[PDB]
Tab-separated table of C-alpha atoms in Angstrom:
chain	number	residue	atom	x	y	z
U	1	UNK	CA	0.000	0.000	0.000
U	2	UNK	CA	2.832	2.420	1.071
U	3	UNK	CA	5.604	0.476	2.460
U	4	UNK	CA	9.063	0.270	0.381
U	5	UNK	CA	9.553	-3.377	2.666
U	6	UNK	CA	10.701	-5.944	0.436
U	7	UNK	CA	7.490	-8.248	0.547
U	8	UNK	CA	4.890	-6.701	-2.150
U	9	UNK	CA	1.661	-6.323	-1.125
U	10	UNK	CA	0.029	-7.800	-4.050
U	11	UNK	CA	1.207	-9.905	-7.278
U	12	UNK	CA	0.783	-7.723	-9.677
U	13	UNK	CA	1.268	-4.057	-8.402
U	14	UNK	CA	4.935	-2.992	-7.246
U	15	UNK	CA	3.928	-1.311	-3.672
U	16	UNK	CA	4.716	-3.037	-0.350
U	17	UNK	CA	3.369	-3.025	3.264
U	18	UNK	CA	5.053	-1.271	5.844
């Protein structure tokens, strides 16, 4: 959502979770 962690939040988008 709008985390730069390494785990993505979903498979196709490029965000991550905090």
């Amino acid at each position: 959502s709008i985390g730069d962690s390494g785990l993505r939040e979903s498979m196709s988008s490029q965000t991550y979770w905090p």
